[PDB]
Amino acid sequence: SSDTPEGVRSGAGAVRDAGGAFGKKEQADEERYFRARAREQLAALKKHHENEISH
Amino acid sequence: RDQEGQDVLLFIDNIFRFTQAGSEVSALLGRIPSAVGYQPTLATDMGTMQERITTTKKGSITSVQAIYVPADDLTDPAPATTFAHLDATTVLSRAIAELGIYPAVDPLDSTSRIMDP
């Protein structure tokens, strides 16, 4: 099919638009990884010394 | 063949523009189309042409025809009616033309029906 202009060819971003098993396995892996980065970037954001003097 | 008894060849280029030009006369004449858009008479117009290409007792006529497959569908009714008439297929691969070989006939993807002990 794909070895001609006529046949169907796949583009970029076609695993998420399908919405199947691999399309759901990708959304819950971008969220369970960038949930821990909202922990380490928020715990180290409390280490401002001027806020502690106000505390 | 009928008057001199030679062994003639015959070249048609191509056979898809004979099928497709048939399904525009049969729709200008007011007829209900068959499957995907072709004519009702797709199997007799290929019958009342390619049965005159035969080996009689005087001589013969051999035909080499070019075949274009629409939308890379081998089971579309235009390259499926034609395939019941052929006896041998030869395929020209472009990947052998960049290897230097001439003629660029693929040896593995060509089949013959008369290849038989």
Residue type, B106: D
Give dist(CA B27, CA B39) in Å, integer. 7
Q: Are the Cβ atoms of A1 and B70 closer than 8 angstroms?
A: no
Q: Are the Cβ atoms of A7 and B72 closer than 8 angstroms?
A: yes
φ, ψ (nearest 5 deg) of residue B68: -110, 125
Give dist(CA A8, CA A49) in Å, integer. 60
What burial letters (b/e) apply to B54-83, b meaning 16+ CB within 10 Å? eeeeeeeeeeebeeebeeeeeebbbbebbe
Nearest Cα neighbor of B83 from B75, B91, B71 is: B75
- Within 1-55 of A, beta carbons closer than 8 Å to B belong to 1, 3-4, 6-7
Q: Is any Cβ of chain A less than 8 angstroms from the Cβ of B4?
A: no
What is the resolution of the experimental data for this entry, in Å? Answer: 3.5
Give the best residue of B72, B73, B91, B94 to mutate against chain A (max A CB count within 10 A): B72
Do the annotations mark residue B68 as ligand-binding? no
Q: Taking CB atoms and an 8 Å cut-off, how many pairs form between chains A and B?
A: 8
Tell me which DSSP letter residue B105 carries. B
Give dist(CA B5, CA A8) in Å, integer. 49
